[PDB]
Amino acid sequence: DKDLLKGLDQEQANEVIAVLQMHNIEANKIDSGKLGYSITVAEPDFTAAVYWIKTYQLPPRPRVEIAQMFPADSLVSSPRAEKARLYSAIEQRLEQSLQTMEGVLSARVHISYDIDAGENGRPPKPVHLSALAVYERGSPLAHQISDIKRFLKNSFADVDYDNISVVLSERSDAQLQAPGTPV
């Protein structure tokens, strides 16, 4: 067996395994504890596994949130930093709320950070919002975008339906059968 990757996290290993199984590559996960997880494949499949690893740029990054740039554990804060943390937490609370709607599997939300200017000496600009979501098969996407827009509109002091973008997509086919083992 040839070594593809070492020292992965749990949530990196499971993503890699998923992506390889989708392409009919049988892989094995081994745990070394403090050294993390290791992924191995057979030689006949080595070439393909390499090419897919490059094509998807595995293993994945950690997930960025703007609050990480302005830690609460810091000796000083400008008002800009506080305002940034505030917005960065509102975003995550909306993302966590949409996932409780009927049929939604996962979602992501973005807010216009007008704070990149102070709004000093000038009237503030209106808010803009964007949302992505994924639905179960057999859902009326057209009839579901109305609900999302309605819900988002009242979460802020001044938002127009024109300023809300919503993109929906369906789940891909399920990978239920196991890959074949090399002869």
Binding site: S78, P79, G118
Partner: protein, 84 residues
């Protein structure tokens, strides 16, 4: 606001750093010269009073050649913020 907040923090910080090194170095000198009395009285720092007296002027002169540049940068910065 955030400009006033910045320039005030930057002031307190510059005081902390520019007053740091001289008092640390003086502590190290005063310690080692106090300790090595444990071997020899080490007159040649403090016995030649004219040389100790010159030392202060030398120190002040050299030090100003490292700090004035810093203060000039800070001054330009604050004037820029005040007027622009």
């Amino acid at each position: 606001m955030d400009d006033l907040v910045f320039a005030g923090n930057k002031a307190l910080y510059l005081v902390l750093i520019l007053s740091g090194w001289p008092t640390i170095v003086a502590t190290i000198i005063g310690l080692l010269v106090g300790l090595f009395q444990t071997v020899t009285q080490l007159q040649e720092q403090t016995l030649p009073f004219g040389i100790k007296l010159l030392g202060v002027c030398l120190c002040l002169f050299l030090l100003s050649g490292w700090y004035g540049e810093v203060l000039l940068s800070y001054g330009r910065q604050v004037i820029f913020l005040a007027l622009a």
